[PDB]
A paper describes a structure:
Bacterial hybrid malic enzymes (MaeB grouping, multidomain) catalyse the transformation of malate to pyruvate, and are a major contributor to cellular reducing power and carbon flux. Distinct from other malic enzyme subtypes, the hybrid enzymes are regulated by acetyl-CoA, a molecular indicator of the metabolic state of the cell. The larger ME isoforms (hybrid enzymes) are predicted to be a fusion of two unrelated enzymes; a catalytic N-terminal ME subunit and a C-terminal phosphotransacetylase (PTA) domain. The PTA domain is homologous to PTA enzymes (that interconvert acetyl-CoA and phosphate to CoA and acetyl phosphate), yet they appear to lack critical catalytic residues and thus acts as a sensor instead.
Structurally, MaeBME closely resembles the fold of small prokaryotic MEs, which form a tightly interacting dimer where the catalytic site is composed of residues from both protomers. Dimerisation in solution was confirmed by size-exclusion chromatography. MaeBME can be divided into three subdomains: region d1 which contains a Rossmann-like fold that forms the nucleotide binding site; region d2 which is mixed α/β and contains an N-terminal extension that sits over the dimer interface and extends into the opposing monomer; and a small “hook-like” subdomain (residues 369–386) that has no structural equivalent in other characterised ME folds and is best-described as a projecting loop with central alpha helix. Comparatively, the hook region is easily discerned as an insert in the primary sequence of hybrid MEs, and packs against d1 via several conserved hydrophobic residues. Our truncated ME construct (MaeBME) retained activity, but was insensitive to inhibition by acetyl-CoA, CoA and acetyl phosphate, confirming that these allosteric inhibitors act at the appended PTA domain.
Residue numbers in the entry:
A (entry chain A): 16 to 421
B (entry chain B): 15 to 422
Write the structure that this text describes.
């Protein structure tokens, strides 16, 4: 592939890799360095020793996020290990900087055991304003995030778990609005039991969907209570009463399909029997469960969102984590909690309803967007997102009492 | 001067809090740019590294990235203030790496005082970094931690507080001996102070040709003599001496070299008066030297003095060591910084000071004249020749000793 070669050269050329650490202050003279280092640097140390909160005033902590991975689930490459994941973590860090102005240290950790990983990461707390866990396989990632959120007094957030849920939650909110639907009666079917599956269900319920209206499926079919095969602690929580056992049966009359599976997992027949104006999230990648065209060919009333920037309504994680961490950092929050995640969902949804500015159109080739079936969420390169979402997260942090700065 | 304290606080909070920023070294504005820096293009270097682990040095910042890691248990001269309070110092250390060797640094402050917790945490960070500079960890824990991490990790691990003073003072000593026509094997050295850098000084001096029988270590309790128990440990005894002397005053009679790692005033004119002809004094107490060059010259006109102060000639400044040492180790993709490499740095620093000083250096220092002798025993910190002289010799020592994985 010529594109793979372009990517290798991109990384290899010039300064190897994609990041550089620079000084934000003058550091060229004896005088400069008498402040940046000994003896002047003793002064902020002594201030922080006396008043711990001042670490946020004299260091980069308040704008510094760790992107931390053990490389056990890198993109779609699987368990390739910490060093091979480093380009991805450097790149995630680039997204933080470009979209939120947040500085990132990417940390690749050679630990696969949950408790070993956690015991190594938790003692890094003094360094960072927040932790973005990335590309850790399930189920370890559930246990790791849960334990670090309890042990650490700074935000801990696994974006692979929650980003899809937050952004698709906002799209689902708008899709329901457009089709005169109330969340408490919407029937949702989730296909796939990966890292982001459960979080989708939790966010949808937080948006007012009912637990009984959600059916989760995996490779073996419907996850029903009593099922034992392929089961575990996490699949068990959202296990359903439904008499359905296959995805085909679960989808009959369903309103929403959340696809976190493989291409072709959604067929015209399943589509045939969904409720009118079906809402389809085809998040499998590289290839969606079904293309927008093949979907509308079978059901012209179908509303569709995918993980791809080729098609309308791209569910892109970059719409979530930059603003969420920006709001958390700005309030020096000790957590990113469900209230802050929900605030991001509603803000994203509300932004899509606004008029789309000229330069957004300009950015996307003169294409005109207006709120509807073809425009349910903001575009990823819409610069309004940070301005719209981060303050709502900040407000939610203050309201829920996890903010430590007004 | 608490108004100088004020200047430093302002410096740290002006514009952006802190002293560091992380930026992209490549285009990252457009969707096309980001299709290379992130999904899907970023999969290509990932797959290459998975097939061949060494390619992590080709496609990431690892080969120019050092961690400055501390638990804040011995920050500068402030003692055990903890990891958050040490963060400005570690950010500052990283600034020195970048300005003097072009090395990128992630400063990592670790909330762990238990040796096992600390080492377990740092060991598994190897995939991230090309090298580890331990900093501001108190003794004796720092000894256990550095030895363990050097053994356990396959990237260089180096505790600059232990070794920097030793390397730079060793270079100065070599040159001081040259000037006074001494042979290292017969030089009598007294080390005053038993902190993190004391033993490493003794080891480097012996590597330079000094003898144990000629070295006497002192502390709070006076001389550390063999057979002493009072306030001893597994590190103090390693250099205990058969001397009949018990106080610092006694130790210094007829001695050639005083190595001061203690407190101000610890060296008085009386004991200076009874040192050998051409006494060599390293007064490296922070912030005020055991004695100033001027009062040392008063008590003893034939005295040769180095201090930790940029104020006085012959500054024993750690910045002469670690930037080049890591530069040499990184560029050869070495698995260690070993004693051979440390020695190579010593000899390179010493040799550089013997050369004619270029106009460029004089101009940097306001037009002052420098020539090898009693007032110029080691290179100036802002001499750009230092990296050019030291890093290649470190690299050659890495290759010669077999720890390099990449030839230069
Ligand atoms: Mg990921
Ligand atoms: Mg230090």
């Amino acid at each position: 592939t010529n594109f793979d070669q372009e990517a290798l050269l991109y990384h290899q050329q010039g300064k190897p890799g994609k990041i550089e650490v620079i000084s934000s202050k003058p550091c060229a003279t004896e005088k400069d360095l008498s402040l940046a280092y000994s003896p002047g640097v003793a002064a902020p140390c002594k201030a922080i020793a006396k008043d711990p909160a001042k670490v946020y005033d004299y260091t980069a902590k308040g704008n510094l996020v760790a992107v931390i991975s053990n490389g056990t689930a890198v993109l779609g490459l699987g368990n390739i290990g910490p060093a091979a994941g480093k380009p991805v973590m450097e790149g995630k860090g680039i997204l933080f900087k470009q979209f939120a102005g947040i500085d990132v240290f990417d940390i690749e950790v050679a630990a696969t055991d949950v408790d070993v990983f956690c015991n190594a990461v938790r003692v890094l707390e003094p360094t960072f304003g927040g932790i973005n866990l990335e590309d850790i396989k399930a189920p370890e990632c559930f246990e790791i995030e849960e334990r670090l959120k309890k042990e650490m007094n700074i935000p801990v957030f696994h974006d692979d778990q929650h980003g899809t849920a937050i952004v698709s939650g906002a799209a689902l909110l708008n899709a329901c609005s457009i089709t005169n639907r109330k969340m408490e009666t919407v029937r949702i079917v989730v296909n796939g039991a990966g890292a982001s599956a459960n979080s989708c269900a939790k966010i949808f319920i937080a948006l007012g969907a009912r637990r009984e209206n959600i059916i989760m499926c995996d490779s073996q079919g419907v996850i029903y209570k009593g099922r034992t095969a392929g089961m575990n602690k996490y699949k068990e929580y959202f296990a359903s009463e439904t008499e359905a056992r296959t995805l085909t049966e679960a989808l009959r009359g369903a309103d929403v399909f959340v696809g976190l599976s493989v291409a072709g997992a959604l067929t015209p027949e399943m589509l045939k029997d969904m409720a009118k104006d079906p809402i389809i999230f085809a998040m499998a990648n590289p290839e969606p469960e079904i293309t927008p065209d093949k979907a509308r060919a079978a059901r012209p009333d179908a509303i569709i969102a995918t993980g791809r920037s080729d098609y309308p309504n791209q569910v892109n994680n970059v719409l979530g984590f930059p603003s969420i961490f920006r709001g958390a950092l700005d309030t020096r929050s000790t957590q990113i909690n469900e209230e802050m995640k929900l605030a991001a969902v509603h803000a994203l949804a509300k932004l899509a309803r606004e008029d789309v500015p000229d330069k957004v159109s300009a950015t996307y080739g003169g294409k005109s967007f207006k709120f509807g079936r073809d425009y349910l969420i903001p575009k990823p390169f819409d610069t309004r997102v940070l301005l719209w979402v981060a303050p709502e997260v900040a407000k939610a942090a203050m309201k829920s009492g996890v903010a430590t700065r007004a």
